C-alpha cells in the first residue's frame, strides 16, 4: 500500500538523504577528572 518502484535486470534504483544537524561524537577521553580540576598550588577563598 506504498508506491514502490519496480525493476528488471536493466533497471536500477537511487536515492539520497541528508543527515540532520547532530553533535559530533566525542572520540576522545578526558585528561582530567571532575574532582581533580583545581589549581594544586593554591588555596580557595571558601571555607567548609
Amino acid at each position: 500500500y506504498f508506491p514502490s518502484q519496480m525493476l528488471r535486470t536493466g533497471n536500477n534504483f537511487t536515492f539520497s538523504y541528508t543527515f540532520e544537524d547532530v553533535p559530533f561524537h566525542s572520540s576522545y577521553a578526558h585528561s582530567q577528572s571532575l574532582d581533580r580540576l583545581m589549581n594544586p598550588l593554591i588555596d580557595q577563598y571558601l571555607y567548609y
Partner: protein
Amino acid sequence: LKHPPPQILIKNTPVPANPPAEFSATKFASFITQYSTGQVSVEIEWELQ
C-alpha cells in the same frame, strides 16, 4: 565659588619589593622605598577693576 578649582591629587605608585618564591595570598606589605620630585606651574588670569 560653587565650582572652585578642583583638588589636584598626586601619589607615588607602589613598587613591590622582591616577593616570596612561593605564592601567598596574604596582603602585600613589602615595598621599594621611594619619593618623587618635579616642578609645578600655575597660571591665573585676573581681571582688574
